[PDB]
């Protein structure tokens, strides 16, 4: 339910029943061998797990500091880590007798992942997507359509992630007996932050085994970008009890933290309640939720997962921010230097990893979670550069 004080289940009474049924189903199936057999089967043969752990030798030498390994979630079917959670929840939803999936999306990767999982399992998919994100992630909009999903543009508010989430939640309140709300990050009311983290923990379980094979030791640092926090939690979680391993989450610095146009909730937000959870949120002078910004639409959310709020409080993980321009430079850099076009979200992690490697010893090891590929971002990057 809680991570320290953070998390919880602060929802209208209409959603208590559906959430409790989800809790019970998850508790029954999370360690069920047959459930995990089907999940592992799809992750392997359909999604293409395990993903490799790649040594960025050109990038490492160029920077001249620590070794930079990339965990290659960009290679997962769909082009991001989102699929790990999408298939897991869709399978659970099907076991619970649901015939419809709904989901918010910003980058469109979760929308696409959800549409793919829905296609695979013969479930109807409606995706809620901010009107601004419909325009700047158009590639993923047409993928969703071709996969047989309906894309619902959301015109209210900031026309982005938070607004998509409000609309999805309103849908779910009405449609829950046959609709599973397939939330795409470690956010929302319990049990979602736990479920999404658990389904993403495969990233870190693989990476741990892979870095032990490559280097015979655990990494000194793990760097991951933080929108809602799922790819970060996925790669972090298996290392949390390893005392050697520093954990760094990288939030969207936007136009700068003083610009009022960023998504760094942990760095510059206040504790508060929204979307069923106590966590960090960007707030205005009256204490209301204020709109966020990032060039990477997957990071463009005023909130953050409560497990990260907890990791920040106990100082198990450090949270930093990287600006739009810094992220753009890393996007170009990785493409030219390693021949990998990353997602703009992932480019934030690369950007900070390049800063951090520079300051570190050649003996030391950084693992960056390369959460996605950048095909979706080509229009954005074309306009910006």
Ligand X SMILES: N[C@@H](Cc1c[nH]c2ccccc12)C(=O)O
Length of the chain in residues, anyone?
385
- 132, 279, 371, 376: the active-site residue: 371
Q: What are phi and psi of 222, to 5 degrees?
A: -120, 125
User: In sequence order, what are the residues at sequence separation of 6 or more whose Cβ sits closer than 8 angstroms to the Cβ of residue 233?
Assistant: 186, 196, 197, 200, 201, 305, 307, 308
Residue of 67, 71, 82, 312 marked catalytic: 82
Query: Structure tokens of 3?
Result: 């991570």
Kindly indicate which of the ranges 7-15, 51-59, 104-112, 143-151 contains the residues binding ligand PLT, using the contact rule CB under 6 A: 104-112
Over the Cα atoms of the chain, what is R_g? 19
Cα separation, 310 vs 76, in Å, equals: 29
Known catalytic residue at 34: no
Q: Please, which of residues 254-283 interact with ligand X by CB under 6 A?
A: 273-276
Of the pair 30, 329, the CB lying nearest a second copy is at 329
Least distance in Å: CB of 262 to Na ion?
9
Residue placing its CB nearer to ligand PLT in the complex, 65 or 229: 229
Shortest reach from residue 113's CB to ligand X, in Å:
8
CA atoms within 13 A on the CB side of 335: 19
Q: Which of 9, 194, 230, 265 binds Na ion (CB under 5 A)?
A: 265
Edge-to-edge strand list for the sheet holding 365-370: 53-55, 67-72, 365-370, 221-225, 246-254, 317-323
Contact between 231 and Na ion by CB under 5 A: the answer reads: no
Residues between 141 and 200 that touch ligand PLT (CB under 6 A) = 161, 184-185, 187
Query: Which helix or strand (DSSP H or E) is residue 240 part of?
Result: none
Can you name the residues that pair with 7 across neighbouring β-strands? 2, 278
Q: Report CA 118 to chain centroid distance, whole Å.
A: 19
11 contributes a contact to ligand X by CB under 6 A: yes
Q: With contact defined as beta carbons under 8 Å apart, do 235 and 204 qualify?
A: yes
Contact between 298 and ligand PLT per CB under 6 A: yes
* Site residues, a second copy (CB under 8 A): 44-46, 48, 51-55, 58, 72, 74-75, 77, 79, 115-120, 122, 139, 142-143, 146-148, 331-332, 335-341, 374-375, 378, 381-382
* Site residues, ligand X (CB under 6 A): 11-12, 15, 104-111, 161, 166, 169, 184-185, 187, 227-228, 273-276, 298, 301
* Site residues, ligand PLT (CB under 6 A): 80, 82, 104-111, 161, 184-185, 187, 225-232, 298-299, 301, 343, 345-346, 371-372
């Amino acid at each position: 339910m809680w991570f320290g004080e953070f998390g919880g289940q602060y929802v209208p009474e209409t959603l208590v029943g559906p959430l409790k049924e989800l809790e019970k189903a998850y508790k029954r199936f999370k360690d069920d061998e047959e459930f995990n057999r089907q999940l592992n089967y799809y992750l392997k043969t359909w999604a293409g797990r395990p993903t490799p752990l790649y040594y960025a030798k050109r990038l490492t030498e160029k920077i001249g500091g620590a070794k930079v390994y990339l965990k290659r979630e960009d290679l997962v079917h769909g082009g991001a880590h989102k699929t790990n959670n999408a298939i897991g929840q869709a399978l659970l939803a099907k076991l619970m007798g649901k015939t419809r999936l709904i989901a918010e999306t910003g980058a469109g990767q979760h929308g696409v992942a959800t549409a793919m999982a829905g296609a695979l399992l013969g479930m109807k998919v409606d995706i809620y997507m901010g009107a601004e994100d419909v325009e700047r992630q158009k590639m993923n909009v047409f993928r969703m359509k071709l996969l047989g999903a309906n894309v619902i543009p959301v015109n209210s508010g900031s026309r982005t992630l938070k607004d998509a989430i409000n609309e999805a939640l309103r849908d779910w309140v009405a449609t829950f007996e046959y609709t599973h709300y397939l939330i795409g990050s470690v956010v929302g009311p319990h049990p979602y932050p736990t479920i999404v983290r658990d389904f993403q923990s495969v990233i870190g379980r693989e990476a741990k085994a892979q870095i032990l094979e490559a280097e015979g030791q655990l990494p000194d640092v793990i760097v991951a970008c933080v929108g809602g926090g799922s790819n970060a939690m996925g790669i972090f979680y298996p290392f949390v009890n390893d005392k050697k391993v520093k954990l760094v989450g990288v939030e969207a610095g936007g136009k700068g933290l003083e610009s009022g146009k960023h998504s760094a909730s942990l760095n510059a937000g206040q504790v508060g309640v929204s979307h069923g959870m106590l966590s960090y949120f960007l707030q205005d002078e009256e204490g209301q939720i204020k709109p966020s910004h990032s060039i990477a639409p997957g990071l463009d959310y005023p909130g953050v997962g409560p497990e990260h709020a907890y990791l920040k409080k106990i100082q198990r993980a450090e949270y930093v921010a990287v600006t739009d321009e810094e992220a753009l430079k890393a996007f170009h850099e990785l493409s030219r230097t390693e021949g990998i076009i990353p997602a703009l979200e992932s480019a934030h992690a690369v950007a900070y990893a390049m800063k951090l490697a520079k300051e570190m010893s050649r003996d030391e090891i950084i693992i960056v979670n390369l959460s996605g590929r950048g095909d979706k971002d080509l229009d954005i990057v074309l306009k910006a550069s």
